[PDB]
Amino acid sequence: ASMIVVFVGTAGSGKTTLTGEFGRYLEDNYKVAYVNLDTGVKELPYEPSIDVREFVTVEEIMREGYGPNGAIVESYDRLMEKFNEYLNKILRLEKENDYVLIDTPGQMETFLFHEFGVRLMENLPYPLVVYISDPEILKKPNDYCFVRFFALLIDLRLGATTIPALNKVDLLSEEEKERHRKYFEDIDYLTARLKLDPSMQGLMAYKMCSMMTEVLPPVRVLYLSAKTREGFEDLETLAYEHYCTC
C-alpha cells in the first residue's frame, strides 16, 4: 500500500515537532498524511488529516470532573468505541498517500497499555515504529541498556519493528554525540562497562544485555534533530528498507 511511521516517545521527548518537521521535509518529494492520536495537546506544527480531539479533548473530560490521569484513560476508553471507524479512517489514508505519519499520545503508556493503541497496531500494514528518546537521560551505562530494552519491549508489545532514536542531537556536543554511539552502534562495550558495575543492578543490567550475545539482531540507533533535519534521510531508507523486507 504505502509507508506508515508511528512516532512513539515519552512526554517532552519532542516527538510531535519531529512528527511535523519530518513530514514537511517529506512533502517536498512525497504525498504525506498526518494522524494525531494524542487527546491532550495544545497546538501541532502540522495539519492533521486525522485528529482525536475532534472527538474528545482531555481538557473536556476535565471541565466534566476527572483529573489528568483519569481524563486520559477515559478518552481512550471512549475511543475504543469510535474505533472500527477511526481505524478504516487510516487505511483510506494509506492508498492516497506516500508516507503516513502517526502521532501517538504523550503518555506513551496510554498508547502502550490500552487496547486502543495495541489493536490499531495490529490493523496497520507493517508499520515502522520510531522510538524517540530524549538524550538527557543517557548519563550512566544502565540508562543505555534501559532505553534499548524498553525499545525492544515496544517492539514486543506493539508487534512492529521498533527503532531506537535519540532526539534533539543539536543540543549535543562533539565527542558526547559519539560517546552515545559508543554505547549504541557498538553493543559490546555497553555490556563491557556493565560487567564493571559491582552493584546488584549492574548484575541484571549486565545480565540483561547479552540480549544480543544470546539472540535478537543488533538494530541501528537513529540520531535525529527536528529543527536541523539531522538523520532525516536515514529515516526514509529504513522506512523503505523495512517496507521492502515486509
Ligand X SMILES: Nc1nc2c(ncn2[C@@H]2O[C@H](COP(=O)(O)OP(=O)(O)O)[C@@H](O)[C@H]2O)c(=O)[nH]1
Other Cβ atoms within 10 Å of 67 Cβ, number: 9
Cell 518529494 belongs to 29
**Choice from 28, 42, 54, 85 touching a copy of itself (CB under 8 A):** 42
- The contact mask relative to ligand X for 11-50 (x = CB under 6 A, - = no) is xxxxxxxx--------------------------------
User: Quick one: cell of 93?
Assistant: 489514508
Strands 222-223 and 162-166: parallel
Pick the closer one to ligand X by CB: 2 or 10.
Answer: 10
- Rounded to the nearest whole angstrom, what is the least distance from the CB of residue 240 to ligand X in the complex? 23
Binders in 182-221 for a copy of itself, by CB under 8 A: 199-201, 204-205, 207-208, 210, 214-216
Cβ–Cβ under 8 Å, residues 158 and 150: no
Pick the closer one to ligand X by CB: 101 or 187.
Answer: 101
DSSP string, 170-186: TT--SSHHHHHHHTTTS
Considering CB under 8 A, how many residues would be counted as binding a copy of itself? 52
DSSP string, 94-121: GGG-SEEEEE--SSHHHHHHSHHHHHHH
Distance CA 226, CA 87 (A): 28
Cβ–Cβ under 8 Å, residues 211 and 190: no
Pick the closer one to a copy of itself by CB: 62 or 91.
Answer: 62
Residues that bind ligand X (CB under 6 A): 9, 11-18, 69, 106, 167-168, 170-171, 225-227
Residues that bind a copy of itself (CB under 8 A): 10-12, 38, 40-42, 58-59, 62, 65-73, 105-110, 113-115, 134, 137, 142, 145-146, 149-150, 152-153, 155-157, 159, 199-201, 204-205, 207-208, 210, 214-216
